[PDB]
Symmetry: D2
Subunit: 484 residues, 4 copies
C-alpha cells in the first residue's frame, strides 16, 4: 500500500517516502509520500484556482449538498474507515466505531445543516445629520485554508476543520499527522468518488518542522491556518504566519483538573475520573491529569480508582476484551516514560502503573504504557503542572471550595475541567469560576457541536462550533447604505 | 515644565527619562513626557493583575455600565480641556475636534455601557446517544489584562474605542498611547482618578514603540491580549511578540482604500463625499480613499470639480476659525509623505493640485503642513497607488465597466474599506457584495454604527470589534455543560 | 375512489359523503367522507393519547428524522401528488410541479433542519439583595394542534402548518378544504407508510360552518388553531376558541397593491404585474388587485398589460399550452362575477375580460373566468377596496411618492405589496413605509422559509417562518434558578 | 373634592358622571373619579391615531429612549407622591410600596429605553431556483394604537409594564386603569404632561370594565391591539370583542400556582419563601402560591413553622411602621374571599391559622382586612385547591414521590407559574423542565428579569412579553425582499 497526496482532483506520488508503523506491534502498514515545498505550492495554487473556477460562488444550499454527499460517502465505507483508524492508532475497535468515525461523519452533517439555516445581522442607523442608513453583514470565504491536524483523534479532528472550511466556501490544503495518514487518505478517496470540483480539497502528506507542515504555514497564498496540537507548535505557527497577518485557529495543550466533592455520587465519579484520565490511553487534550478529591473521601477514592484502573486490559484492538490501546509511537512513549521517571525523582507515591508492560511477543515492539496514578506531589511539582499526554493522573486532597477553585485555576493552561457534585448551588457557582473553555458537571467529553469549543491562556486561540465556525472561516463585510 | 506622567495603580508616577512633546503647527515644545522602561511596564501589568483579583473581576454588568457612564460624565465635565489637548497634539481644526474626536470619545463609553447591560447568552439542550440529557450554557468572564497600543491619528477616539469595551467586559487595562499624542489620554487618566475607579483597573504608560514601552507591553508574559490599531508591519511584529504566550490579538491595520464613482451617481454629492474621504484629518485616517475610480463619461468633469473644492480648503492653524485642514502629525511624517509626492512624479503622475508644502513666512513653517493633493495618470501597478501614504492625497483613474472596476478595487494586499457612489438599486448591492474589504459604504463614508462588525481583511486586520464582536473578544467564553438525567 | 379520514393510524370511513367535483369540467372525481362531532372528538382523543404515549418526549433529532422520512415519502410519489393537486384545483401542471408539490416537500425539510439547529436564550440575574440567578428558556409542545387549511394552494399551505407543528413535538388534527381533499389524503398515506406513531397525525374530512371545521375549533381539548383563509372566518374562529383562550395563528385576506414608478424596468414590471395579478387565476392571498402606475407611463403600461393578459391561454391543465386554470368552484365564480358586475355599476372601464369564457364543450361545466383589467375607479370604490380573490386588477395613475404611499396604506387589509423601481434610495425608503407583512422590490411571491411571514390589520395574527414558528407551536417556560 | 380626570390629547378633561374612590383601610372616600362613556373612549382612540400620523410614528429609537428616561426621571422627582397615591388606593404597607411598586415602576421605563436603543434585526440572502438573488431584511414599525387595560393588584407596576414597551416601540396608547386604583395612573398622566410628551401619544381614560369604558376600548374598531392583565374569564370576553377586527392580543390571566418543597430543601429558606409566595400583597398577586406540596417526611414540621411565621405577620394600616400585611382591595373582594373560606370548611379543610377577618374596634373594621390563612386536608379535586381565590391563603398537602408531585402540579386548567425548593442539582433541573407553566423558580419566587419571556400557558395567558417578545408584540414585523440580481 502507498499513501499518495491528493492535488487538483487526482492522486499524486512524490519524492521520498517514509514508513507508516503500527503502535501495536511495530509492523510496517504502508509507505507514505513526502511533500516538498514545490509540491505544497502546487496544492496551494490548485486551491486558489478552484476558488476562481467557481467554488467561491456556490450557494450555501450547494455546499450543504456536497457536505452531505461526503458524509454519505464515508458511511458507505464505514468499516474501511474504522479499520484504517484502528491500524494507525491502536485504538480499541468499539471506541473507533462510536467516537472516531461516527463523529467524523456527524461533523459534515452538522455544518451542512448550520450553513443552510445560518442568517445575518441587520442594523438601522439614524445619523445626527438626519440621514438614514441600513447596515447588513455579509460573509465570503477567507479563500484557501491550510489545515494541520494532530495524531490523537485523526479523522475526528481532521473533519472538524475540513467540514466548516468547505461549508463556508473555502478551498482547503490539508496535512494530516505523519503518524496517522490513513483515514485522511480514505477521505480523499471519498472526495474523489463524489466528484468534488478539482482543487477544492487537497491532501498533502509529510512531516512538520522543516517539512510539509512548515512549508504550508509559510506559504504567502494561504488565507489562514487551523491547528490542533502542542502549545509550543502553536507559538511557532503564530510567528510563521505573522508577516502575512493570516487568520489562526488553535486548539492546544491542557493540564485539566477533575474535582470530586464529598457530596458527589461516589461510584459515578470514580468511573468518570477513570474515563477522563485513561480514554485513548490519556492522549486527549481534554484528559484529566490532575484530580482534587475532598479530604473525607480521598483515601477511598484513590483505592477505588486503583482497582478500576488495574481492571483495564491493555492490548491489541483485535482482542474484544482490550479496553486501552498503546500510545501513538515509541518516541511519544519515551517522553511519557521520562515524566514517569521525573515523578519518582519528585517524590511521588506510585499507586499503580509507572512503566511499560511486558508481553513476551510482538506487542513489545509496540508502544504500550500502563495506566498510572500518583499521590503525594505538591501543586508546584513539574509532573502536576506540565502536560504529559499519557495515561496518568495525580490525586490530591482538598478541604474547602475556595481553595480548590484557586488550585484548579493555578495553571498556565485552561482547556477544560470536570466537577462532581450532587448539589445545585455548588455545581453552578463552582463551574462559573473555572478559567477554562469548557466545564462539565457530572460528565466529561460530551460534545454538542453547536456550542463554542476552544481553550484559554496557553490552550488555544478562538472558538469553533456554531456561529464561531461560521465567523472564523469567513470574511465579514459590513455593507452600509445611505437610503435618506 | 508640564510633565506628563504615567498612571499606575491609582497614582501618577514619573520615570527616569523623558522626551519632548512638540506641536505639529509651529514645532514649539508643549510638554515633557515620561518614558516607561521595561521594569515600569511590568509594574503596570502586575498592578492590573492584582486589581483583577481584588474584585474588579467580580463586578456585575450593571456595576460596570455605571462606571462607564461616570467616566463619560467626567470627560463631558471637562469637555473644553479635552478639546484643547487634542487640538494641541494634532493641529486638528477646533470645530472638528469638538464634534468628531471628543464627542465620539464620550459616546464610546455610553455605547458599551448600554450593550453590556442588555447582553445575554446561549442555552442548548443535549440528548446524548446513551439516553442521558445535559444542559449547556455559555458564560463570559474577562480575559484578564488587556494591553492597548493606540495610534496618533484620532487619539482620544481610537483610545476609547478599545478602553471602553475592555473595561465593560470586566478586564483591567494597561494602555500606551502614541508618543506623538499623549495629552488627551493623560486627561482620561485624570478622569479615571477623579471618579475613583479602583487602583490598577486602568493604567497609562507613556513611551515609544519599537524597543520601547509598546514592544515591552506586547512581550509581557502576564498580559492576556493585545489590541492594536496602526501600521500592518507593526501588527506583524506584535503577532510574533505575543506568540510564545498565545495571547489573544485584535488588529486594525493599514489600508489602500478605493472610492468608486459610477456615471449614474449623484454628481455633487459624490464630489463632496470624495473630498471628505480623501482629505479628512489631512488624509490621516486608515479609512481614507487614496485611490479613486470614476466611470469614463464623467471622469474629466469629476477631476475638475474636485480640484476646485480642494483648492477652496484653507490649510493652517486651528485657532483660525477659517482653517479647514490642519498639519500632518510630525515633520518626520511629513518627510515620508513628501517623499511619496516626489515618487508619484517619477512614476509619471500629473499633479492636478497640491504636491508640496505651503509657505507661510512665520513659525507655521516650522510645523508639518502639506497641501491637499490630487494625481492622475498612474497605472494600477504604480507604488503610489498601491502603498499606503497616510497623507492628503488621492489618485483618480477612469474605468469603463462594472466587472473591471470590481477587479481593480480588489487588486490589493490590503482590504480595509471602500465607498461606492451610485443611484442604482441593483448595482449598489451587487457591487458592494463583491468588494473584499471589512466595510463597504454606498453613498456615504466613515459612518460608524458601533453595533456593527468593524475590521479589515487580508493585511488590513485580524478579528472584528463592535457589538457582540467586542463582547466576545474582550471575554473568555466558557461552555458549562451539566448532566441532569 | 373514496377519500377517508385518517385517525389513530388507520383510515376510517364515516357517515354521509359528498362528491369531489372538477373545476375544469364538473366531472365527479370521488366521494369524500364527512366527519361528525363524535368523529372529530375521536381524532382529538387519539392525538391527546399519542402525546402521552411518547411523542411528547421525542428529541428534536428524532422529530427531524421523521420529517425527512415524510419528505422522502412524498418525493417517492411525486407524480401521484401532482396529479391529485391538478385534479382538485385545475392548476396548470407545470405550476403544480414547481410551486405546489416541491414547496410542500421543502416545508418538511426546512423545519427539520431548523429544529435540529435551534437553540435557546440564557440570562444571568444579579439581584439587588446580592443573590445570583440563572435563567434559561425551554420549549415544550402546545399539545394538540387543530389545522384548518384553505383550498387555493392545498398541499403547500397544509404542509406549511403540519410540518412545524410536528417539528415542535405536537400532535395534529387537520381538516383540509372540502374543495381540495386529495393531496392531503395522499399525505396521510405517506404518514401511514413511514409508520408515524398512531394518533400523532390525524386527518378529518368535511365542511366548515356547522360541520367538521367548526367542531374542531370548539373542542375543549385542542391547544391551538391555525387557519389560512377569509378574514371573516378568522373572526368566527377567534370567537370560538375564546373561552379556552386557545392559541391562534391566522393568515387571512388582503387587497394588495403593486406600485410601478416611471424609473422602473418597464418590461419586467409589466411581466411582474401580470404574474402578481393572474397567478393561480388570481386566487392567492398575495395577489395584486390594485395597481398604481406613475402617470407618464400609465397609458402604455395599461396597453402592454392588456396585450400580455390577452395572450394568456385559459383552459384545462392537460393542454401544455394552457397558462391559466379555472377558479376553484362555480360557487366561488359566482362571487367573483358579482364583483365584475359591481365594477360596471361603479363606472369602471373594462380594459379586458369582465366575464366567463365560452368553450362549447365540457369545459363550460367548469369554473373558468377571463383575466380582467379595470381602470377609471376612485380609491373609495368597493371594487378596489374589497378582496375579490379572482384574476383581476384595477390600475390607476399617481403623481408623487408621498401620495402613492398613502394610497397603498389606505386599506383595512395589510398583507403584501410589490414596488417596481431601479432607484436605490427610492426602493428602500418607500418599502419601509408600507403597512404590510411583506414588501417585495422588483419581485413577487419569493418565499425564503426562514423569514417572518404573515399579515397586519385584517390580514392576520402572528408570524410563521423560522423562530416565529418555533415559538408559536411551543409553550415557552422561563426556568429561573437561584445559585447564590 | 379631589376629582380624578381623564387625560386625552394633551389635557385633563372630566366627563358627565363620576364614581367614588374608597379606601380599603377604613372605607372613607378618597376622591371622585370621572367615568368615560363610549363617545369619550372613541375620542381618545382618534386622538391616539392622529398622534401617530403627526409624527410619533416616525421617532427614532434614540428619541424614544430619551422620552422614556425623561418619564422615569419625572416619576423619581415625585417619588413620595407616587408612593402615597399607591398606598392610599391599595392599603399596601409603605416600605413595600416604595421598593416593589414605585421603584420597579420606574425601572420598567429605563429597561425598555435601553432595550430599544440596542435592538437590531435579521438579514437573509436568497438564491432562487431561476438563478436570481435577493436580500431580505426584517423591519419593525409600531402596531399603531395600543389599548391597555390594567389590574388593581399592583397598579403602577403592571400599568408601566405595558405602557413602557408600547411607547418604546413608537405606538400611541389609550390606557384604562382599574376603577379600584385610579390614583397612581393619574399621577403618571401628570408626569407625561409635565415632560411635554406630544398630545395624543399617551391617553388615560377612567372607568369600569364590563359594559363600561374597558369593554368600549376593546370593541373599538380603530385600536390596533389590546394588552390585558387580569381574570381569565375577562380575557375570553376581550378575545371575542376584538375578533371582528382581528386585533392583536396579549394576555396575562389567572393562575392556581403551586410551591413544591422536597425533604432535601433548605428548610428555613423554603418556609420563609412560601410565607412570601403565599401572603405577599395579602395574597393578591397572580403569581402567588395557593397550593403547596411538601414531601411527607418534613410535612408536619413545615406546616407548624409556617403557622408560626404567619401568626407573626401584623395585619393593619400602612401608616403603622409595624404593619406587615395590608387589607384586600375592596369589601366586595373580601366578600368573595370569605365565601371561599366558608367553602373550604364545607369541603372538609382543617384551618391551621386564620380563616376570617380581624376585629379592630375602630374604623379599620370598615375596611377590607382578612387574616393570613393556611389549610390542610383537601383532595386535589376540591374547588378550594382548584379555583383561583386571590387572597392570603395556601393549602398544604403531603406527597411521596417525584413523578407523583409533577402530575399533581400539572393537574390544572391554569399554567402560570410554579416554585420548587430543593438543594439537589439533577432534581432541580429535571423537575422544573416538566412543569407546564410560563415560569418556574428554583429556590426563589417572583424574581423578574425583564429580558426573559413572561406569560402563561393553558388558561393563564396568550403570548409572551419581556425582552424581544415585547419588542415583537408591540411592533408589526415587515420582511422587505429586494431583488439584486
Ligand atoms: Mg506510527
Ligand atoms: Mg451511582
Ligand atoms: Mg471571519
Ligand atoms: Mg509632535
Ligand atoms: Mg479571533
Ligand atoms: Mg473571547
Ligand atoms: Mg370542487
Ligand atoms: Mg428589462
Ligand atoms: Mg409559544
Ligand atoms: Mg376602593
Ligand atoms: Mg401571539
Ligand atoms: Mg408584532
Amino acid at each position: 500500500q502507498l499513501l499518495r497526496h491528493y492535488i487538483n482532483g487526482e492522486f499524486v506520488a512524490s519524492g521520498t517516502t517514509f514508513p507508516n508503523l503500527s503502535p501495536v506491534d511495530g509492523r510496517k502498514l504502508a509507505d507514505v509520500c513526502e511533500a516538498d515545498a514545490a509540491l505544497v505550492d502546487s496544492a496551494v495554487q490548485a486551491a486558489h484556482a478552484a476558488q476562481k473556477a467557481g467554488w467561491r460562488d456556490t450557494t450555501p444550499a450547494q455546499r450543504a449538498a456536497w457536505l452531505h454527499k461526503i458524509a454519505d460517502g464515508i458511511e458507505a465505507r464505514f468499516d474501511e474507515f474504522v479499520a484504517a483508524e484502528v491500524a494507525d492508532t491502536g485504538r480499541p475497535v468499539a471506541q473507533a466505531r462510536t467516537l472516531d468515525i461516527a463523529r467524523g461523519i456527524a461533523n459534515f452533517r452538522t455544518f451542512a445543516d448550520l450553513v443552510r439555516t445560518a442568517s445575518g445581522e441587520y442594523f438601522e442607523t439614524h445619523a445626527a445629520d438626519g440621514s438614514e442608513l441600513i447596515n447588513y453583514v455579509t460573509r465570503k470565504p477567507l479563500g484557501v485554508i491550510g489545515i494541520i491536524s494532530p495524531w490523537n483523534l485523526p479523522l475526528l479532528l481532521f473533519t472538524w476543520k475540513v467540514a466548516p472550511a468547505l461549508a463556508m466556501g473555502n478551498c482547503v490544503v490539508a496535512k494530516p499527522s505523519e503518524e496517522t495518514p490513513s483515514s485522511a487518505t480514505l477521505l480523499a478517496e471519498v472526495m474523489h468518488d463524489v466528484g468534488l470540483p478539482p482543487g477544492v480539497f487537497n491532501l498533502i502528506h509529510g512531516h512538520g518542522q522543516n517539512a510539509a507542515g512548515e512549508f504550508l504555514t509559510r506559504h504567502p497564498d494561504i488565507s489562514a491556518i487551523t491547528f490542533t496540537g502542542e502549545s509550543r507548535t502553536g507559538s511557532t505557527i503564530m510567528k510563521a504566519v505573522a508577516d502575512g497577518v493570516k487568520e489562526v485557529s488553535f486548539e492546544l495543550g491542557g493540564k485539566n483538573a477533575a474535582v470530586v466533592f464529598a457530596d458527589a455520587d461516589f461510584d459515578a465519579a470514580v468511573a468518570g475520573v477513570l474515563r477522563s484520565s485513561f480514554t485513548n490511553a490519556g492522549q486527549v487534550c481534554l484528559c484529566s491529569e490532575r484530580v482534587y478529591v475532598e479530604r473525607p473521601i480521598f483515601e477511598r477514592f484513590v483505592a477505588a480508582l486503583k482497582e478500576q484502573a488495574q481492571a483495564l486490559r491493555v492490548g491489541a484492538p483485535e482482542d474484544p476484551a482490550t479496553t486501552m490501546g498503546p500510545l501513538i509511537s515509541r518516541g511519544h512513549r519515551d517522553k511519557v516514560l521520562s515524566y514517569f521517571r521525573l515523578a519518582v525523582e519528585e517524590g511521588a507515591t506510585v499507586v499503580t502503573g509507572g512503566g511499560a508492560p511486558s508481553f513476551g511477543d510482538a506487542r513489545d515492539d509496540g508502544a504500550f504504557v500502563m495506566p498510572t496514578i500518583w499521590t503525594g506531589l505538591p501543586d508546584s511539582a513539574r509532573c502536576v503542572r506540565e502536560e504529559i499526554f499519557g495515561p496518568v493522573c495525580h490525586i490530591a486532597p482538598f478541604d474547602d471550595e475556595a481553595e480548590v477553585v484557586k488550585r484548579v485555576n493555578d495553571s498556565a493552561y485552561g482547556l477544560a475541567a470536570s466537577i462532581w457534585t450532587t448539589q445545585l448551588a455548588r455545581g453552578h457557582r463552582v463551574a462559573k469560576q473555572i478559567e477554562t473553555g469548557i466545564v462539565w458537571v457530572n460528565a466529561w467529553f460530551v460534545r454538542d457541536l453547536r456550542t463554542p469549543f476552544g481553550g484559554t491562556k496557553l490552550s488555544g486561540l478562538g472558538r469553533e462550533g456554531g456561529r464561531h465556525s461560521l465567523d472564523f472561516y469567513s470574511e465579514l463585510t459590513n455593507v452600509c447604505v445611505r437610503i435618506a
